[PDB]
Design a protein around this ligand. Structure first.
Ligand SMILES: NCCCCCN(O)C(=O)CCC(=O)NS(=O)(=O)OC[C@H]1O[C@@H](n2cnc3c(N)ncnc32)[C@H](O)[C@@H]1O
Ligand SMILES: NCCCCCN(O)C(=O)CCC(=O)NS(=O)(=O)OC[C@H]1O[C@@H](n2cnc3c(N)ncnc32)[C@H](O)[C@@H]1O
Ligand code: MG
Ligand code: MG
Lengths: 592, 593
C-alpha cells in the first residue's frame, strides 16, 4: 500500500550486495562465453583481471577454474580500479564500460540496463526475506522451495527482469514474494475463442471440477443478465497484470462488443511459479496449474502464450504420455510428464490482420491447464523443482548437499539415483526417438523420498519439445514439433542443456561444498551413460554417430543470444540459426 | 481501488458503437482535408460522397457540407460501410486496416496506432457515461468544469487521446476527463544529480514553503534525518504517481537504493490533471502553482516526458518574454500575459546519459516545473476558460462560443473582434515585430471572460514551444537556444497553419453550422482586424509585404500525416521544419477581403 514500504527493500547495503553478486556472475559467465579472457594476474596465482572497453577501468578478482570452462569467481575478491583508485561495484557502470566488448547495441543497452536494474531490485527484495537453510526449505515443502529459490536461470545474467511490472506489481506477482494471486476470469465468445480438450476431458465437467458448480452458475448468471447465452462463451483465466494493463485497453473493442466479458476473480488463491506466468493452486494443490499469457519481458522473450498453438497442445501431451507408458525403458526410469490437459485460445481477427505470424500481438490471450504432481505422491514422497539442487543457502549448504546428507548414501550412489531418474530418459529420448526437451531446473520436478530422487517429472512440453527428424512418423496433431537440425548440432540438446547449462553448476557446487569432487561427478555421469548404452546394442550405430564421449563439443553461448536480441533471443522459425558457437569445450566424459 | 467490472463498465456495445461512428466521421473529415483520400460523389447524388478501401471492394458513403480551407463537415449519422453488396458495422479498427496503405501505416506502426485508436475510443466511451452538461452549464461550473468537460481533444488529430501506458485503472485515476483528484509523489533528490532553477525573484527555501507549508517541509526533512541524511544535500521533485510506480521506482532503482532519490510520500493538496495530462492544477489551493511532471506515456505523436537538461533555461526564457511583453505597448494594449514557468527541477541520470544520445526518452523521465496560476489576477466578474472551449459543442448543438455570444448581447462580429484583439493580434505583432512564433492552439491558450466577452488572453507552455525565427537575433545567453532557421516560404505558416487551418477552420465552420455567424462574416472580421493592426504600424510595411497574409493561397500543412509516418516522434526537435508534409495549397479566405 505505502509509497515508502514498496521500495523499503531498496537500501544501500542490500543494493551493494546485489551488485557484487551480479558482477561476480557477469565475470564468471562472460568469461565462460569467451566474451572476454581474464588475463592471469600481477603476480598472484589464482588472481585475474578484466578491463573495460577503453582499458582504464580494471576488475580484478580471484577465481577457481573447473570443468567445462567454469569460473567460480569469489564475490568478496572483486575490486573495481581506475587511476589506481578503488571505485564502488556498480553493475550498470560495468555494462556501459563493456558495451562494445559485449554485443550491446545503442538500441538494446538502455533496455538491458532496465533488466539489470530490475534483477538487482529482486535480489534486494530476496535479501529482506527471512534466512532459510536448505533443511528449512525442505521442511517448508514444495512451494517453500519454489518461492525460496533465489538465483533463477544460472547462465543468464539478466535473468529476472520481469519488465512491465511496476514496483507494486513486482511485490504482488513475483514468485519469490509468494503473495497469493486471484486470477481474472473472462467469458470469451465462441466466434473468437476455442477450447481444446486432452483425452478424457469434457469442457462442461472440466470447468465444474476446476471452478465449482456454484461459480460456474454465478458466471452463467452474469452472462444471462447481460442478455448473453452462456452456451456461446468459454472461460479464459487471465493474469491480473495482463487484464488491467493490456487486455482492458488493447482489447477494448472485444470487451465493449461483449466478445469478452469480465466475470471477476477466482475464489481459489494461486501462487506464481518460477516461470512467473504459471500458477499453482494454493487453496487446492490437487487442481490444475494455470498457465497464462503475460506480456512481460523476461530473459530473452516476451512471456505471452500463442492462441494458435493451443489447438494442438493437449494432443502433443497425450502422444508423449502414451509414448512413455508404452516404452519399458522410460517406464523403468519412472519418468512422467504432468500433462497440459486443456487449453483455450482467443483469435483477435483485427490484430492478426495487422501483424504477421511471429507478432507478440497474437500471444496476448490464451491459457492452458496442467496436471498437478501432488495427488500422485505416495507415502513419504515430496516434490522439489530441480533448480533446488543448485540453490545454495546462507550457510553455504546446497539443497543437493542436504539431500545427500539426509539420505545416508555415498554421494555417487545418491547422484546415480538422480541421473537415472532425470538424465537417462533424455538419452533414450534422443537415441530412440530423436526427441529433445528444454530440461533445465525450472522445467523439471523431482520426487524425493528418504532424501533420494525416486523419479523425475517433466513439464512445459508442447512449447518446447522437438523431434529432430523431419520425416518422422507421427500423428498429424504432433507433426509440427518436427524440425531439421544440423547433424553436428543434434547432440547439443544433451551437451548444452544438460552438461554445460546445469551439470556444470551442480558439479562445481558439490566440489566447492566438499561433498563430491568433480572427477567423481563426471565419472558417475559416464557410468550412467554407459549403463544405458550397453543395455541397447541395437542402437550402437546411433551411439557412434552421436558420440557422447567425443573429446570436445561446441561451446554454445547463452548470454550472447540475449545480448544480441533481448526481445527475442531465438527465431522460432529457425532456432538453430540464432545459436552462437564460439570454439569448443573439453568434454568431461572423454576418456571415461 | 475499485471493482474489476466497474472499471470497464463504460465499455458497452452502445457507447462503443457511438464512439466508432464519431471517430470514423473525424477520420473521413480530417483525412479528406489532408488529401490522404479524395472523396468522390457517389451515383451523382448531391452531397453524397464515397471513400473506398485500399482494394476498392469496401465503400464508405457519407454526406458532407464543404466549407472554407477544404473543411469537410461529415455528418456522423450518414456514414455507411458497404462491401460485397451488404452493409457492415462501422469499426474504426477495420477502417484503418482496410486503408493501411492509403494512409501510409507501415507494418511496424499499424498495431501500435490501433492501440492508440482503441484507447481514444475507450475514452470517448467513458466521456459518454458522464452527466450531460450544456455550454451554459459548463460556464456555470467554472474553470475546471470546462477543463474536464472538454471532449474532442485536438481537433485535427484522429488518434489524439491515446495516453498509451495507462491501464484501465490508471486511466480512471489520471485522465483529465475523469477529474479525479491526484496526490503528487514527492522525491528528495541529491544535489550531486539534481538542479533547482529559479526564475526572477524565487528563493528555493521560501518557494517550497509557500507551495507546501512549513509543516510538510519539516516533515520531509524529518524523513531524511530519520534515514541519517542531511536535508541541506537534497532538493524536492514532484512526480506523477504513474511515473513513480511504473518507471522511476524500477528504471531508477539504483538511484533510490543508493539514496540519491528518497521517496518522501504524498502531497496534502489535491491536484487535477489538465488537458495535457501531465500538468496539474491545484484544486485545494487554486492560487498555487500548476505542477508540470514527466510522464513517459505516448500521446498524440510524442512521449510526454520532460527534459531535465532543458529545465536550466526554462524560467529565464519566461522571464525574458514576460519583460518583452511588459515593455511593448502594442502587446500591453491587447492585454496579453503569460503564466510564467517560475521554477524548475531536473535530475541528471549520469549512467543513462552515458548510455544514450541527447534525444533519448531515458533523459526525459525525471523533471518538473511550477507555473503561475492565472486565478489571483482575476478582477471582479472575470472567469477563466481554455480556448478549446470555443470549439466545444454540447449535446444540444450549442458551442461555448455560441453561448458566450448570446450572453454578451453583442453582435457576433463585435464579440469576435474582442476575441481577435485579445488572442490573434498579439500573434501578428509577435511574428512581424519579433520573428516570434508560439504553439497557440486551444490547449495552450486561456481566455479571460467578463459579461460573456473575451477581455484578454493568457498564453502558457512557453519555453518548450516558442521559436525566434532569426538565428542572428540578439538575446540573453539562456534564450539563444530558441532561435531557429525556418525557410522563408514557411515562416508565415506559424499563422496560416497553427491559427487558420488548425483552429479558425473549426471555429468558423462551427459558428456557421450553429447559425450564429456566416463564414464570410467571420473571415471578413479577421481580415478587418488584420488591416487594423497593419495600418496602425507602417514602420513594418516592408515585412507586411514580405510575409503577405493576404496571398491568394498558402501551403496545406498536414498534421495527421506526421503522426501516421512516426507516431512516437512526429517531428525531430533539431529540425522541426523537416518533418512537415506540405501537400498542395489552400485558398486563403483573406484573399478577397
Ligand atoms: N536448445 C536450447 C539451447 C539454449 C537456447 C537459449 N534459450 O532459448 C533458453 O535457454 C530458453 C530459456 C527459457 O525461457 N526457458 S522457459 O521457456 O521454460 O522459461 C522459464 C522461465 O522461468 C525463469 N526461471 C526462473 N528460475 C529458473 C531456473 N532456475 N532455471 C531456468 N529458468 C528459470 C526463466 O527466466 C523463464 O522466465
Ligand atoms: N508550426 C507547427 C506545425 C504543426 C506541427 C504538428 N505538431 O507537432 C503538433 O501539433 C504538436 C501539438 C502538441 O503536442 N502541443 S502540446 O505540446 O502543447 O501538447 C498538448 C497536449 O494536450 C492534448 N490536448 C488535449 N486537448 C487539446 C486541444 N484542444 N488542442 C491541443 N491539444 C490538446 C494533446 O493531445 C497533447 O497531449
Ligand atoms: Mg518453462
Ligand atoms: Mg501544451
Amino acid at each position: 500500500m505505502s509509497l515508502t514500504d514498496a521500495v523499503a527493500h531498496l537500501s544501500p547495503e542490500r543494493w551493494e550486495e546485489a551488485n557484487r553478486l551480479l558482477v561476480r556472475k557477469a565475470l564468471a559467465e562472460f568469461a565462460h562465453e569467451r566474451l572476454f579472457t581474464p588475463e592471469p594476474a600481477d603476480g598472484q596465482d589464482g588472481r585475474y583481471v578484466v578491463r573495460s572497453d577503453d582499458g582504464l577501468t580494471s576488475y580484478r578478482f580471484t577465481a577457481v577454474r573447473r570443468a567445462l570452462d567454469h569460473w567460480q569467481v569469489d564475490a568478496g575478491s572483486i575490486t573495481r580500479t581506475r587511476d589506481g583508485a578503488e571505485l564502488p561495484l556498480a553493475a550498470l557502470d560495468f555494462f556501459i564500460e563493456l558495451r562494445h566488448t559485449l554485443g550491446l547495441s545503442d538500441e538494446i543497452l538502455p533496455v538491458y540496463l532496465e533488466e539489470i536494474s530490475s534483477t538487482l531490485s529482486g535480489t534486494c527484495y530476496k535479501l529482506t526475506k527471512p534466512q532459510v537453510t536448505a533443511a528449512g526449505l525442505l521442511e517448508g515443502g514444495f512451494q517453500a522451495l519454489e518461492s525460496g529459490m533465489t538465483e533463477g536461470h544460472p547462465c543468464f545474467v539478466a535473468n529476472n527482469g520481469r519488465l512491465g511490472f511496476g514496483v507494486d506489481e513486482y511485490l504482488a506477482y513475483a514468485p519469490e514474494t509468494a503473495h497469493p494471486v486471484r486470477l481474472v476470469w473472462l467469458a470469451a465468445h465462441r466466434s473468437r475463442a476455442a477450447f481444446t480438450a486432452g483425452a478424457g476431458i469434457d469442457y462442461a465437467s472440466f470447468v465444474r471440477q476446476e471452478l465449482g458448480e456454484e461459480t460456474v452458475e454465478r458466471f452463467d448468471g452474469v452472462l444471462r443478465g447481460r442478455g448473453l447465452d452462456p452456451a456461446d462463451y468459454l472461460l479464459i483465466p487471465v493474469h491480473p497484470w495482463q487484464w488491467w494493463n493490456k487486455l482492458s485497453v488493447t482489447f477494448a473493442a472485444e470487451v465493449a462488443r461483449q466478445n469478452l466479458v469480465c466475470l471477476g476473480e477466482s475464489d481459489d488463491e494461486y501462487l506464481a511459479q518460477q516461470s512467473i506466468r504459471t500458477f499453482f493452486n494454493a487453496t487446492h494443490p490437487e487442481k490444475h496449474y494455470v498457465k497464462t499469457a503475460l506480456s512481460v519481458l523476461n530473459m530473452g522473450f516476451m512471456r505471452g502464450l500463442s492462441a494458435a498453438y493451443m489447438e494442438a497442445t493437449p494432443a502433443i501431451n497425450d502422444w508423449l504420455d502414451r509414448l512413455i507408458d508404452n516404452d519399458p525403458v522410460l517406464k523403468s526410469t519412472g519418468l512422467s510428464i504432468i500433462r497440459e490437459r486443456a487449453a483455450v485460445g482467443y483469435r483477435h481477427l483485427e490484430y492478426e490482420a495487422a501483424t504477421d505470424r511471429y507478432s507478440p500481438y497474437r500471444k496476448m490471450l490464451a491459457a492452458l491447464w496442467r496436471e498437478s504432481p501432488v495427488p500422485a505422491l505416495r507415502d513419504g514422497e515430496s516434490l522439489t523443482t530441480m533448480a533446488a539442487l543448485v540453490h545454495v543457502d546462507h550457510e553455504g549448504r546446497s539443497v543437493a548437499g542436504e539431500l545427500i546428507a539426509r539420505s545416508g548414501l555415498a554421494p555417487t550412489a545418491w547422484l546415480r539415483h538422480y541421473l537415472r531418474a532425470y538424465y537417462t530418459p533424455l538419452l533414450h529420448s534422443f537415441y530412440a526417438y530423436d526427441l529433445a526437451f528444454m530440461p533445465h531446473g525450472e522445467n523439471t520436478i523431482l520426487v524425493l523420498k528418504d532424501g533420494v530422487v525416486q523419479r523425475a517429472v517433466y513439464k512445459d512440453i508442447a512449447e518446447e519439445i522437438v523431434v529432430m527428424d523431419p520425416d518422422a512418423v507421427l500423428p498429424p496433431e504432433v507433426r509440427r514439433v518436427r524440425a531439421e537440425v544440423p547433424e553436428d548440432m543434434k547432440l547439443l540438446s544433451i551437451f548444452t542443456d544438460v552438461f554445460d547449462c546445469f551439470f556444470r553448476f551442480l558439479a562445481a557446487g558439490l566440489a566447492t561444498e566438499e561433498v563430491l569432487a568433480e572427477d567423481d561427478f563426471w565419472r558417475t555421469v559416464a557410468e550412467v551413460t554407459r549403463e544405458y548404452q550397453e543395455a541397447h546394442p541395437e542402437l550402437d550405430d546411433r551411439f557412434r554417430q552421436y558420440d557422447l564421449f567425443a573429446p570436445e563439443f561446441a561451446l554454445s553461448c547463452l548470454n550472447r543470444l540475449q545480448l544480441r536480441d533481448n526481445r527475442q533471443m531465438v527465431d522460432l522459425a529457425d532456432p538453430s540459426a540464432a545459436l552462437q558457437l564460439v570454439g569448443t569445450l573439453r568434454n568431461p566424459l572423454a576418456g571415461l
